């Protein structure tokens, strides 16, 4: 049917733009020329990252950027469209460094969306940047607007959408219209900031790209998979912050939607979006990491899973002990806590002491270094089989990943995703999704189809009785009930006919 989106970040820091070269990996590890025609054909979107919002409350490049070299880099990316008439070169505003609560530019995000006049100036600057540099759409990665800033954020997205639609008409771009996306939270704590207004946030978007990764990290006391598809009962659980969001729902409604504690998984984030009325599955994009998160000081017993650890959480990494054995990129980047898939393959292939293990519940791989007590959570072409099947079963919009430079040299992870979506001779009908824990929540937007006897006036219904009435299946919350379903508080709408 409709092609699944495959959205890959291209991240390049300012110093690499300013010294851009395609022939020295010690200066630019991943130049645009490494995105071969074959890789360009497997992508639908490249998110060029990151631009910012400046103190003038406009979308802007880092002011240290050499503009001529920035245009040259973007021009190399948009040249790739010659190989793929569906490909878009988006640009992303924000990211964690610029826009987190304590980030260097955070107040500019708050202020840019705060008033109608600020939103107009900001929205215009986004489309002006898009047109000036030749980008194909706008991606906003504010991590994350707080509950009080959400209305301004929503209005800013609405205003950008209108201006993008004007631009599509002006440029005759109906065959490849300018798009608007966001990187959205992939876990319930950050998601709770704007969850109650999710439908308004998603309405002006082509896609909401869920950051369904970093669900574990050195900031948690217990090692865990950072992007488990489904839950492992042996693993940690978390409070479900969504049950405290300002939804106006009843106790039964909140309880049915937000089991707590729950397993912090990719499936949980996807289902949490689908539960909200007005959030269509086709706009939800599943983020996946092309990197692993490494932990030290772990115990044995379960391959390093669910163990205490001694991994520093600070930025920058606080000393020069690059303890992730074999991770040469970690030495370059002065941080042993993140390793690209590219590097992880080499670490497993070399004489470095890792064993690749597989969790059949989470459907994700992990490395365990038994001698030194290291644990690495990552994703690979095998975990992507299950995530791709989930994307197709749940009718999601596609996949997003951070980032292109972390795929291996041959682009095997990107090629795998493209294969699972598009290869005629790939068959996952028999791929077993396992018995990992599913997120069981149901909300107004994902009522299951059900059948039940028609409601009968005058009948006294005990607690838990199910009836069909006026298009839906309803359940009594207590007994005995005689009211018509929907006329009072006694009936829970549990399914659709």
From Swiss-Prot:
Catalysed reactions, as listed in the record: Random endo-hydrolysis of N-acetyl-beta-D-glucosaminide (1->4)-beta-linkages in chitin and chitodextrins
Signal peptide segment: 1-40
GH18 domain ranges (all copies): 41-424
A GO biological-process term: chitin catabolic process
Active site per UniProt: 143
Keyword field contains Electron transport: no
GO molecular function annotation: carbohydrate binding; chitin binding; endochitinase activity
Pfam families, alphabetized: Glyco_hydro_18
Keywords for this protein: Carbohydrate metabolism, Chitin degradation, Glycosidase, Hydrolase, Polysaccharide degradation, Signal
Domain Chitin-binding type-3: 437-497
Keyword Hydrolase annotated: yes
EC assignment: 3.2.1.14
Any GO CC annotation of this UniProt entry: extracellular region
Positions annotated to bind chitin: 67-68, 94-97, 144, 211-214, 402
Entry's family note: Belongs to the glycosyl hydrolase 18 family. Chitinase class II subfamily.
Protein name: Chitinase B
